[PDB]
């Protein structure tokens, strides 16, 4: 029914703790809604945008923290740490907010409890990407991932040795390798029936990539609508 996978379960545990401690679970938050432009869609709600861009800044900070938790990541040179972060960041921003989707209310919750409906996500700065991101959220539900699988996935995404301008890409590959076998196994243990789940979940990174690509272009357009300037951290990550 299984076997020993010792020093891979310990790694798996490191990833779950790293994730949970940097990303409060949905059920564990004090939700609160807002009244601002909840009725109809608009180009950009300066009010909603203000809080959103701040929660984005904060989530980025937690992401960097999650990275430094991943064994070996700090071992990579600063340049390669930055290269990896800058490439996967948006992919994970997407992943996180989507695991905060409430199917029935059709909303999303941030780490401060703030819970916006589809239309408010649009006005917060999602624009044309709204329906696309929300579609992805609904595609995740039927998989019923847990914090372990979500953390492992975000890790596989960040620790990718195919990024451009990377100095020790095989050092990165080596680090990613176990994260893959760790996931492969954990899914087999967490599920004794549906056996085609490793691939299905694994190539959801593929889905993230599409959205992250179209996402960067949204981020370019946004600077054309914004009162002043992009949060320095956001610009630093999107260059």
């Amino acid at each position: 029914s299984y076997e020993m996978t010792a020093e891979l379960d310990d790694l798996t545990e490191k990833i779950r703790k790293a994730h949970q401690e940097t990303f409060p679970s949905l059920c564990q938050l004090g939700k609160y809604t807002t009244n601002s432009s909840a009725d109809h869609r608009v180009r950009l709600d300066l009010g909603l945008w203000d809080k959103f861009s701040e929660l984005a800044t904060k989530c980025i900070i937690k992401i960097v923290e999650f990275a430094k938790r991943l064994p070996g990541f700090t071992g990579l040179t600063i340049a390669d740490q930055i290269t990896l972060l800058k490439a996967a960041c948006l992919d994970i921003l997407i992943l996180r907010i989507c695991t905060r989707y409430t199917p029935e209310q059709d909303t999303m919750t941030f780490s401060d409890g703030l819970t916006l409906n589809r239309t408010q996500m649009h006005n917060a700065g999602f624009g044309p990407l709204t329906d696309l991101v929300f579609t992805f959220a609904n595609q995740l539900l039927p998989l019923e991932m847990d914090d372990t699988e979500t953390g492992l996935l975000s890790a596989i995404c960040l620790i990718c040795g195919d990024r451009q301008d990377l100095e020790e890409p095989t050092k990165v590959d080596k680090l990613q390798e176990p994260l893959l076998e760790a996931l492969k196994i954990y899914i087999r243990k967490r599920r004794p029936s549906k056996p085609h789940m490793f691939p299905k979940i694994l190539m959801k990174i593929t889905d993230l990539r599409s959205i992250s690509a179209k996402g960067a272009e949204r981020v370019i357009t946004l600077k054309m609508e914004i009162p002043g300037s992009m949060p320095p951290l956001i610009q630093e990550m999107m260059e």
Partner: peptide
């Protein structure tokens, strides 16, 4: 980068 450097170097 000013931020990433700091945040990473810790």
């Amino acid at each position: 980068h000013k931020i990433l450097h700091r945040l990473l170097q810790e």
